[PDB]
Amino acid sequence: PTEFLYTSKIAAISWAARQQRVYFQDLNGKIREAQRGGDNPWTGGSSQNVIGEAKLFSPLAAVTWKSAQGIQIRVYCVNKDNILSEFVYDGSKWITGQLGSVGVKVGSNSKLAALQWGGSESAPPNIRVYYQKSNGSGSSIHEYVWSGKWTAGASFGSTVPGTGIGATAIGPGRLRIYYQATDNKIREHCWDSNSWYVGGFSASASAGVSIAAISWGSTPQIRVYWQKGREELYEAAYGGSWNTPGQIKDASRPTPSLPDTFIAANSSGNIDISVFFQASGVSLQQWQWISGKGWSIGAVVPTGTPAGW
Amino acid sequence: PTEFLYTSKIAAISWAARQQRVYFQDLNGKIREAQRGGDNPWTGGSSQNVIGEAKLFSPLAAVTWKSAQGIQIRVYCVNKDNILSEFVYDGSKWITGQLGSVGVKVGSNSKLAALQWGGSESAPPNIRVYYQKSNGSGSSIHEYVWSGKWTAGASFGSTVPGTGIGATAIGPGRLRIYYQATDNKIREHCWDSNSWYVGGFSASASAGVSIAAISWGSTPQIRVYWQKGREELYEAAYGGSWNTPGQIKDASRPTPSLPDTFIAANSSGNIDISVFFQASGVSLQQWQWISGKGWSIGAVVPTGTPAGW
Numbered sequence: 001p002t003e004f005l006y007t008s009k010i011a012a013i014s015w016a017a018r019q020q021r022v023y024f025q026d027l028n029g030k031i032r033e034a035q036r037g038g039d040n041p042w043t044g045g046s047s048q049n050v051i052g053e054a055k056l057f058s059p060l061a062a063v064t065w066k067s068a069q070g071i072q073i074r075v076y077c078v079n080k081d082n083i084l085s086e087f088v089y090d091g092s093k094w095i096t097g098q099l100g101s102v103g104v105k106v107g108s109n110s111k112l113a114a115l116q117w118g119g120s121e122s123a124p125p126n127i128r129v130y131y132q133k134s135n136g137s138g139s140s141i142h143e144y145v146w147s148g149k150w151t152a153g154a155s156f157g158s159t160v161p162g163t164g165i166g167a168t169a170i171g172p173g174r175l176r177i178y179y180q181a182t183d184n185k186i187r188e189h190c191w192d193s194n195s196w197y198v199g200g201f202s203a204s205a206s207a208g209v210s211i212a213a214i215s216w217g218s219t220p221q222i223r224v225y226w227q228k229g230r231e232e233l234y235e236a237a238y239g240g241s242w243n244t245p246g247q248i249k250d251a252s253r254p255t256p257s258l259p260d261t262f263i264a265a266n267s268s269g270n271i272d273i274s275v276f277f278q279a280s281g282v283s284l285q286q287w288q289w290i291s292g293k294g295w296s297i298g299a300v301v302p303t304g305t306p307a308g309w
Numbered sequence: 310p311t312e313f314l315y316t317s318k319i320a321a322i323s324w325a326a327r328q329q330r331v332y333f334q335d336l337n338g339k340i341r342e343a344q345r346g347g348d349n350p351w352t353g354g355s356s357q358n359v360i361g362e363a364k365l366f367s368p369l370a371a372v373t374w375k376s377a378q379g380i381q382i383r384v385y386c387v388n389k390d391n392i393l394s395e396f397v398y399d400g401s402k403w404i405t406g407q408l409g410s411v412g413v414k415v416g417s418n419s420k421l422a423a424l425q426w427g428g429s430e431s432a433p434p435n436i437r438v439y440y441q442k443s444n445g446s447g448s449s450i451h452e453y454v455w456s457g458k459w460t461a462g463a464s465f466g467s468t469v470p471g472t473g474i475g476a477t478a479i480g481p482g483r484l485r486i487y488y489q490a491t492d493n494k495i496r497e498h499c500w501d502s503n504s505w506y507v508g509g510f511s512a513s514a515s516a517g518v519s520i521a522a523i524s525w526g527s528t529p530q531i532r533v534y535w536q537k538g539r540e541e542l543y544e545a546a547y548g549g550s551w552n553t554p555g556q557i558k559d560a561s562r563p564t565p566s567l568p569d570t571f572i573a574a575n576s577s578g579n580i581d582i583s584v585f586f587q588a589s590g591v592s593l594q595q596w597q598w599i600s601g602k603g604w605s606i607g608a609v610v611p612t613g614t615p616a617g618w
């Protein structure tokens with residue numbers, strides 16, 4: 001056995017250096033980090049890798065950028081009073097961030113997504129966090145905004161209860177948000193300049209899929225992932241138009257995730273992609289995309305070993 | 310969500326009064342109790358119902374009898390040093406029992422079973438606890454004995470790694486032990502008077518099934534249960550001869566347990582039977598046998614609600 005909480009949410013980040021970090025919850029409610037550099041074995045995931053804490057079964061999201069102080073990471077979660085909360089890696093240490101002090105109440109079954117653009121050693125970051133206030137069918141998605149200070153943003157959509165949410169900045173100040181609407185279709189909401197509008201993407205999916213989204217490049221390339229636990233992973237790809245969604249699967253390892261589990265995706269470069277899932281073990285696994293090979297299940301991420309094992 | 314640890318072991322007891330108790334592990338490693346009287350709703354299962362603690366994913370077993378001091382319960386488990394341990398309900402309170410002081414080392418992946426006969430308001434109890442020392446294929450089952458003081462008993466069998474173990478006293482000082490041998494057959498070891506011998510029962514089963522056994526009456530009646538997580542429950546029945554094993558299932562709720570989960574059974578009277586399993590939720594469920602109706606899935610057993618839900 002491991003210390004990975006069954007039906008923990010997952011969050012993941014990646015940057016060119018390739019450095020990856022993945023966040024998950026342990027049996028004690030702590031948020032742990034595992035790390036990978038290049039194709040070296042994963043490190044971390046132990047009781048010595050706690051970065052924060054949240055209510056048990058808290059949703060999670062994470063973003064990263066490089067700053068003059070080093071690598072910045074923000075991990076979003078919910079506390080035991082269902083208040084939207086944030087842990088900060090400030091380039092050298094983990095601390096509690098300012099978002100928790102705002103008093104944003106989140107629906108108990110809400111998921112979280114986050115995106116960032118612009119942050120660098122010569123420009124400030126722009127963060128957007130997406131959440132729901134209500135658990136019921138037809139609830140909207142709400143946005144909280146950091147472009148110097150936290151303030152409320154938009155609300156949009158009418159969703160399945162506790163919908164998955166994918167969020168990606170496809171270009172500077174250009175946002176795409178993916179969620180599952182009340183007809184069980186994945187839908188898309190878009191910001192290009194001065195307004196939100198309904199996007200052209202849609203796809204039928206199992207009720208209650210976990211959703212993730214990434215993007216890169218100039219077209220830009222967008223990939224939207226969804227998975228119901230113990231069903232195969234799906235990907236929709238945009239390269240100027242949307243393709244027909246396809247399964248990412250391994251005939252020798254059918255539907256490798258456990259029921260009622262979540263996914264997370266990261267990307268960096270042009271292009272490295274990880275899509276994390278939770279399997280028997282309880283284990284943290286991932287799909288990996290490699291140029292010239294395709295998709296495969298990669299190395300297992302360590303998530304601790306309880307005493308007596 | 311609940312506070313039921315996913316892939317927790319389960320132990321259950323029942324006595325005529327019908328009182329049931331079921332034991333499971335929570336996310337913090339505590340052993341909790343839920344209670345039922347007659348067909349009234351289940352009670353307990355909360356953080357206020359802790360009876361002991363054990364290593365995370367500890368095996369569990371339990372027995373009960375009535376004494377001059379009240380209802381006696383013994384719950385067997387393993388501590389973080391893999392030492393066989395015991396919690397005592399002494400008729401009025403929960404305390405730590407004497408077995409832990411003996412120093413019986415248990416294999417990390419061992420299951421536990423226990424039986425009792427003879428204990429009453431006019432006779433002392435006789436307890437037997439079954440465990441393994443080694444995790445490997447071909448390991449034996451070992452017995453610890455209470456008939457006034459703890460001492461070692463028999464060792465027998467050659468098992469699948471971490472085999473399920475069922476144990477029942479089919480009559481005064483008459484014992485039947487069920488386990489899965491290295492050929493994946495469920496086998497039977499028997500004590501009637503002065504020696505252990507190989508029983509006539511055998512049945513093919515999926516590798517690694519969770520096993521439970523109960524018995525009652527004068528024939529006697531024996532029932533042996535086995536289940537692999539996310540497969541249907543099986544029962545073999547003895548009423549003078551063994552039947553062909555059959556599935557206990559509900560066409561509207563196929564294979565209702567989660568992968569890699571465990572079962573436990575209780576019985577009392579002539580005859581009431583519960584077979585507990587772990588399902589999505591994470592929930593503690595049970596099959597129930599009712600004279601004139603047959604088998605059905607009964608009321609859900611409460612297993613706590615984490616803060617923020």
Ligand SMILES: CC(=O)N[C@@H]1[C@@H](O)[C@H](O)[C@@H](CO[C@@H]2O[C@@H](C)[C@@H](O)[C@@H](O)[C@@H]2O)O[C@@H]1O
Binds near residue numbers: 097098146148
């Ligand atoms: C007056 C004020 O609020 N100043 C803030 C500083 O105290 C703070 O250190 C910085 C950075 O905040 C951290 O990073 C940003 C991007 C958010 O993630 C925030 O929640 C987090 O605390 O911001 C102001 O300068």
Ligand SMILES: CC(=O)N[C@@H]1[C@@H](O)[C@H](O)[C@@H](CO[C@@H]2O[C@@H](C)[C@@H](O)[C@@H](O)[C@@H]2O)O[C@@H]1O
Binds near residue numbers: 395397405407455
């Ligand atoms: C001298 C000695 O060990 N005496 C024992 C008592 O201290 C003890 O209270 C009783 C009962 O023990 C409890 O119940 C038995 C059936 C076992 O479950 C045991 O492990 C548990 O502590 O036993 C002796 O009289």
Ligand SMILES: C[C@@H]1O[C@@H](O)[C@@H](O)[C@H](O)[C@@H]1O
Binds near residue numbers: 071
């Ligand atoms: C960017 C930083 O990289 C390593 O120093 C980790 O130990 C930190 O937790 C953080 O992820």
Ligand SMILES: C[C@@H]1O[C@@H](O)[C@@H](O)[C@H](O)[C@@H]1O
Binds near residue numbers: 128143152153154191
């Ligand atoms: C990029 C945009 O930034 C602010 O204008 C928000 O109010 C919008 O909703 C959007 O996030």
Ligand SMILES: C[C@@H]1O[C@@H](O)[C@@H](O)[C@H](O)[C@@H]1O
Binds near residue numbers: 200238
């Ligand atoms: C980048 C593209 O932007 C808009 O055209 C959307 O309608 C598309 O679905 C896609 O997100």
Ligand SMILES: C[C@@H]1O[C@@H](O)[C@@H](O)[C@H](O)[C@@H]1O
Binds near residue numbers: 235237271289
């Ligand atoms: C980066 C890759 O882009 C296209 O080749 C897709 O068909 C793959 O699934 C992957 O997203």
Ligand SMILES: C[C@@H]1O[C@@H](O)[C@@H](O)[C@H](O)[C@@H]1O
Binds near residue numbers: 342344382398
């Ligand atoms: C036999 C006893 O019954 C009730 O008093 C429960 O509260 C105890 O924990 C025990 O099961």
Ligand SMILES: C[C@@H]1O[C@@H](O)[C@@H](O)[C@H](O)[C@@H]1O
Binds near residue numbers: 452461463484500
């Ligand atoms: C009923 C019998 O009791 C003792 O003799 C033990 O040594 C045996 O193994 C068996 O449990």
Ligand SMILES: C[C@@H]1O[C@@H](O)[C@@H](O)[C@H](O)[C@@H]1O
Binds near residue numbers: 485508509
């Ligand atoms: C009660 C019966 O006892 C012996 O005959 C065993 O061989 C049987 O399988 C059964 O346990």
Ligand SMILES: C[C@@H]1O[C@@H](O)[C@@H](O)[C@H](O)[C@@H]1O
Binds near residue numbers: 532544546580598
């Ligand atoms: C008590 C009952 O006995 C027989 O009727 C079996 O066929 C049932 O499955 C049940 O064990």
